[PDB]
Amino acid sequence: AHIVYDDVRDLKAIIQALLKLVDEALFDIKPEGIQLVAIDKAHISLIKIELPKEMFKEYDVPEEFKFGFNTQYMSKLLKAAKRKEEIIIDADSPEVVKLTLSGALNRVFNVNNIEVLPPEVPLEFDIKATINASGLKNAIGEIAEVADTLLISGNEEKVVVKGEGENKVEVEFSKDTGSLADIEFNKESSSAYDVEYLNDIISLTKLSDYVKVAFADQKPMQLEFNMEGGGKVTYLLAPKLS
Ligand SMILES: [Zn+2]
Ligand SMILES: [Zn+2]
Ligand SMILES: [Zn+2]
Ligand SMILES: [Zn+2]
Ligand SMILES: [Zn+2]
Ligand SMILES: [Zn+2]
Ligand SMILES: [Zn+2]
Ligand SMILES: [Zn+2]
């Protein structure tokens, strides 16, 4: 296997979110691309990653292999990688993966593979809204500072998020707020979620300018981050009743 990706910052943002859900995870490296699924202990939130070969500068993987890793270990390896730089992965045997960070002058890490079994992995929505990622990020952070639950409601024109309780750090996403690019509307809906979980994965918002937010009354919220080249990271969060 030999892979070159043009921007280590995206892997960094993915690892920052994963370490909040799990201590270990598994990249399933196949000839057509890389996949990963991680679910937290309580089976309340999950992250799925799909990185097709088409999104990499170089991707030559004649044989599949599973790369198990400790999320905090990888976060610290990547810690000193602030600028957009290439990351090269070459693995000739199961046991170790060589990661080379380019630019910001050369760092090479030989990472030993560890055993990690993939979650025993098992979607209809009332509203699916494409909204400004930074706007959502701001909203999640502000609500988390003052509430424990984020309420979301949507109709044919907008999605509104606010914290549950007295006054409201309320934020509206719509064309008239210049933050909604598109919306698929089936039925007006309102749901509730633990904002602590959403704040944990806020780094995924660096992956794309827009995020597709999908939900239905008392059903999971789904956030989809579509990346350039066909990449997609999906975050799923179980609902509260209200
Ligand atoms: Zn090879
Ligand atoms: Zn190469
Ligand atoms: Zn090789
Ligand atoms: Zn109405
Ligand atoms: Zn109407
Ligand atoms: Zn909570
Ligand atoms: Zn947490
Ligand atoms: Zn509540």
From Swiss-Prot:
**Molecular function via GO:** DNA binding; DNA polymerase processivity factor activity
Determine the domain of life of the protein's source. Archaea
GO BP, sorted A to Z: leading strand elongation; regulation of DNA replication
What does the subunit section of this Swiss-Prot or TrEMBL entry state?
The subunits circularize to form a toroid; DNA passes through its center. Replication factor C (RFC) is required to load the toroid on the DNA. Forms a dimeric complex with PCNA3 and a trimeric complex with PCNA2 and PCNA3; does not form homotrimers.
Q: Which keywords annotate this record?
A: DNA replication, DNA-binding
Give the family per the record. Answer: Belongs to the PCNA family.
Its organism's taxonomic lineage begins at:
Archaea, Thermoproteota, Thermoprotei, Sulfolobales, Sulfolobaceae
Short name of one Pfam family: PCNA_N
Query: What is this protein called in UniProt?
Result: DNA polymerase sliding clamp 1
The record's function comment reads: Sliding clamp subunit that acts as a moving platform for DNA processing. Responsible for tethering the catalytic subunit of DNA polymerase and other proteins to DNA during high-speed replication. The trimeric complex inhibits DNA ligase and both 3'-5' and 5'-3' activity of Hel308 (Hjm) helicase, but stimulates Hjc, the Holliday junction cleavage enzyme.
InterPro entries reported in the protein's UniProt record: DNA_clamp_sf, Pr_cel_nuc_antig, Pr_cel_nuc_antig_C, Pr_cel_nuc_antig_CS, Pr_cel_nuc_antig_N
The source organism is Sulfurisphaera tokodaii (strain DSM 16993 / JCM 10545 / NBRC 100140 / 7) (Sulfolobus tokodaii)
Q: Which PROSITE patterns match?
A: PCNA_1 (PS01251)
Gene3D superfamilies per the UniProt record, alphabetical: 3.70.10.10
